[PDB]
Amino acid sequence: XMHTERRGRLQLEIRAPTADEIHVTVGEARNLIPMDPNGLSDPYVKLKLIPDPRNLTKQKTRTVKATLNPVWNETFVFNLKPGDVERRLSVEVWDWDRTSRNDFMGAMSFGVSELLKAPVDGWYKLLNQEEGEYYNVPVADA
């Protein structure tokens, strides 16, 4: 109904132990799109709270070279402030490139206020970069 996957899927867990922090675990991705001449990609995940007019919240995973099915298993802490109720946690998969700019692969986002009320733990459909700033889509059940 909205869950046709065209860019792969990403496994995530997000919890807010208290209102002042969220813990984000980036698991793994499956079925990513090739964005290199070798038919592979070099994926990493960029995390930030948007809007970030001062570019101060960005964190990222390691890059996994030469794969369309990366496993990261990395956890990140965001320390939150009252202003963050207006913000969204942005999650973007990017293809690292050596000789050109990195290429966008897929994205999604979660409202901070929604994360403060309910945790995330599951697989998610990767969206285009524009959609990704506004929505997340849990994968459909079989």
Query: Residues annotated as binding site?
Result: 35-36, 42, 95-97, 100-101, 103
Residue 30: C-alpha distances to residues 40, 67, 86 (Å): 12, 10, 31
One character per residue 31-60, x = contact with Ca ion (rule: CB under 5 A): ----xx-----x------------------
User: Least distance in Å: CB of 1 to ligand PLP?
Assistant: 3
Strand partners, 138: 124
The answer to whether 12 touches 47, Cβ cutoff 8 Å, is no
Q: Identify which of residues 6 and 65 has a Cβ nearer to ligand PLP in the complex.
A: 6
User: Least distance in Å: CB of 131 to ligand PLP?
Assistant: 14
- C-alpha 85 chain-centroid distance: 19
Strand duo 88-95 + 43-50: pairing:
antiparallel
> What is the 3 state secondary structure string of 82-105?
HHHHHCEEEEEEEECCCCCCCEEE
User: Least distance in Å: CB of 43 to Ca ion?
Assistant: 8
Q: Does 6 bind Co ion (CB under 5 A)?
A: no
Q: Does 101 bind Co ion (CB under 5 A)?
A: no
Which does residue 13 touch among Ca ion, ligand PLP, Co ion, none (CB within 5 to 8 A, set by kind)? Answer: none
What is the contact surface with Co ion in residues (CB under 5 A)?
1-3
